[PDB]
UniProtKB/Swiss-Prot annotation, chain A:
GO CC, one annotated term: toxin-antitoxin complex
Protein name stated in the entry: mRNA endoribonuclease toxin LS
Subcellular location: Cytoplasm
Subunit composition and interactions: Forms homodimer in solution. Forms a complex with cognate antitoxin RnlB and with enterobacteria phage T4 antitoxin Dmd.
Curated annotation (Swiss-Prot), chain B:
UniProt comment concerning the protein's domains: Composed of 3 domains, the NTD (N-terminal domain, residues 1-90), NRD (N-repeated domain, residues 91-197) and DBD (Dmd-binding domain, residues 198-357). The DBD is responsible for dimerization, growth inhibition upon overexpression and recognition of T4 antitoxin Dmd (via residues 327-357) and antitoxin RnlB and subcellular location.
InterPro entries: RnlA/LsoA-toxin_DBD, RnlA_toxin_N, RnlA_toxin_NRD
A Pfam family annotated for this UniProt entry: RnlA_toxin_N
Effect of a null allele: Not essential, slightly smaller colonies on minimal agar plates at 30 degrees Celsius. Strongly reduces RNase LS activity, restores growth of an enterobacteria phage T4 dmd mutant. Altered mRNA half-life for some cellular transcripts, including an increased half-life for an internal fragment of 23S rRNA. Allele rnlA2 is due to a premature stop codon at residue 33. Sensitive to high concentrations of NaCl, sensitivity is eliminated in a crp or cyaA deletion mutant. Increased levels of Crp and thus increased levels of cAMP.
Localization (cell): Cytoplasm
Naturally occurring in which organism (per UniProt): Escherichia coli (strain K12)
Protein's name according to its UniProt entry: mRNA endoribonuclease toxin LS
Biological processes, Gene Ontology terms: defense response to virus; mRNA catabolic process; regulation of DNA-templated transcription; regulation of growth; single-species biofilm formation
Example GO molecular function: protein homodimerization activity
Lineage, highest ranks first: Bacteria, Pseudomonadati, Pseudomonadota, Gammaproteobacteria, Enterobacterales
Upregulation: Repressed by IscR. rnlA-rnlB forms an operon, the downstream rnlB also has its own promoter.
UniProt-listed Enzyme Commission number(s): 3.1.-.-
Keywords: Antiviral defense, Cytoplasm, Endonuclease, Hydrolase, Nuclease, Toxin-antitoxin system
Amino acid sequence: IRSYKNLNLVRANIETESRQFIENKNYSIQSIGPMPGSRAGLRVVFTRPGVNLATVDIFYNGDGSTTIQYLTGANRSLGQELADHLFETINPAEFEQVNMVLQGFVETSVLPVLELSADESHIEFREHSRNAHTVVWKIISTSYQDELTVSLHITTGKLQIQGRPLSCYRVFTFNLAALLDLQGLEKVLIRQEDGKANIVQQEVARTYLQTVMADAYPHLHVTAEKLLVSGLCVKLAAPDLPDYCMLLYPELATIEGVLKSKMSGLGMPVQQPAGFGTYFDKPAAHYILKPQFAATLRPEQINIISTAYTFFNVERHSLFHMEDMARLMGKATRAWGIIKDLYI
Amino acid sequence: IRSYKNLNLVRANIETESRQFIENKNYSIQSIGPMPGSRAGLRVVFTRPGVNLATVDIFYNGDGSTTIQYLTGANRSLGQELADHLFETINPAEFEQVNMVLQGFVETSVLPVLELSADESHIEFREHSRNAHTVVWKIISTSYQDELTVSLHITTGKLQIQGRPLSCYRVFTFNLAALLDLQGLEKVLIRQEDGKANIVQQEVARTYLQTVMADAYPHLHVTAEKLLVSGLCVKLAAPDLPDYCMLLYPELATIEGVLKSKMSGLGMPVQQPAGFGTYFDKPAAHYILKPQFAATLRPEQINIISTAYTFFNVERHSLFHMESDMARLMGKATRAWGIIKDLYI
C-alpha cells in the first residue's frame, strides 16, 4: 500500500529535489511556496499540458520529520508521482527502528568501542546523560542525519541500543562483534530477539569450517576459530530477511584479527593512531603494499596480503554506506579462501 | 539409580547367562531352581568363601518381561552383582519407547515398504487387525524379541509407530526414509516431536553440500540431493541424544538410490529378490566384485563400486544389530561423502 507520513527527509533538499524532478519530466511549475496559514511547510502546485493542476502539501512536523500530503487539489495521480519520488529518495532501512538489550557491559568495556567507532571519519560520539542508574551516549553520522542512542544501565550491566539500522548501527556493531557472545552476535546481526543459532550443533558446523580450510585449520588462532564458528551458526540459523549483506561481520572482523596478527608479524605493526593507512597504498581497485616494506617480502605474501586488505576495506566500506542469500554465501566463501591463504 | 522391574530378558538364556557369571567369579552355587507357587521364574542362591548367602529371585511376568528381586535373602551387596550383570546384558535402547505419528500415507505406500523390510532375515511383518478406520500390522524380530506396531488410519492417512527403537524400528524407517519429507524424516531420526530442522537455512546447507561434492554437484541425482540436504538440516538441528549412529541414514539410502542407478547403468540391474548379493563376493570384510562381472569393466570402476558396496553394507549391518557420539557420526558422514562423490566418475 505504501504510506507517505512522517518521513525522515533531508529538509534542505525538499525544494530542489522537486524542481530537478519536474524539469526531469518536462512539466510546468505553477507555484512553489511556503504553505498558507499557520502551518509550516511547502505547497507545490504544478502540472503539464493535457491534465489538471496537481497540488502537494509538505508539513514539517515537530520532531524533525516531514509528512507529505498528496491527497489534495484537483489532480492526485500527479501529486503521487512527486510523493513516490521523494519517498524513494530515502534509504529503505530508515523505515526500521531498533531497540534491543545486550547483557554484560561496563563503562571501561564500552568506552573503547565508542572510541574505536569514532576513530572512523563520518562518526562522532558524545556523552548525552548520566545518573546513578544509567549513562547514555549519542552517536551521530556527520554525513547523513542518523543518530544512535546507547544506554548503559550500570546498576544492572545492560546495554540498550536504540535508533535506526543505518551507517551508525553497522559501524558500531562491527567494532562490537569482537566482544559479543553467540546470542549477542546473533541479536545484532539479524536484529531479531528469538534467533536460534544457539541450537546449532557446533560439531557439524565445525566439520564445515574444517572442511573449508584444508591445511590451514590445525594452525588456526583460537580467537579466530571461535568467532568464525559462531558466525557460521548465525548464517545457518537466520530466518527470512530482505538484506543479508550484514551477515559477513564474522569473517571481516576475523580478517582484521588475523591481518593485524600477520602484518605486525612481518615488521608492520598497526599502531592505534596510525591505523592501517600508514602501511598500504591504493593504486587502482586493489590496494598494494608500500614498496619500502614489500621489498623485504616474497611476492606471494605481497599478493596475498594485498588481496586480503583490499577485500576487507572494500567490503567494510560498502557495508557502512549501503550499496540476496546466495550472493552473501559466495562472498563468505571468498573471505574463507582469503583467511586460509593467510596461513602459508 | 536404576530399577530392575519389567525387563525384556531372553528367557531360555536367563539361567545359562548366570552360571557363566558365577563360575567366572569363582563363587559357589547354593541352589538354582524354579520358584514355588503359581509364579514362573527362577530363584538363585549363591555365595563365596568369606561372605553371606545372596538370594536373587526372578519373576517371569505375564507380558514377557522379567522382574529381578535382589533385595531378599541375607546378602544384597552380592545379589546386586548378578542383577547388574543380567541388567547389562540388554542393549540400552530397550529402555526407551517411541510413539509417533507421521502424516501422508495410504495403504499402497506402506505395503511395498513392509515387503522391502521383510526381505531382511530377522524381520517379519503380518497383518494384525483391520476395520473401516485403521489397519494395523505387527513387525517382529524373530532373532530378538522386539515387536513394532504400525497403525495406519486410512480415514486421515496417519501412520502411527509404537514400540521400541530396536532392530525393527531401524529397518522399517530405513526402508521408509526415501519417501518422507523433511519433518517426517527428522521425527523418525531423533524420535522427538518438536524437532527444529525446518528452521535451518536450506541455502547454507546447500552451500555446504556444494563444498563437499566438488565436480559431482552438477551431476547429482536430484532425488538424491533433496534427501541429502534434508538429512544435513536434520543433522544440524538435532538436540542432545545418547546415540547419533542413527542420523547416518541420509547418505546410506542415497548410495542405494545411486548404486542401483549405476549398477543397472553398467549392465548390473538389482532385481527385487536377487538383491545386491548377486554381484559381489566377500573375502575379508571387504566385498569384491565377482570376477565374472569385474572383468567386463575398467579397473577404475572395480575399486570404487566395491568400496562403495562394502561401506554401505558394513554400516547398515552395524546399525541393524546395534554394535565422541557426534564426532563419530560426522566422521562416518565425511567418509560417506567421499564415497558418494567418487561414485560420480
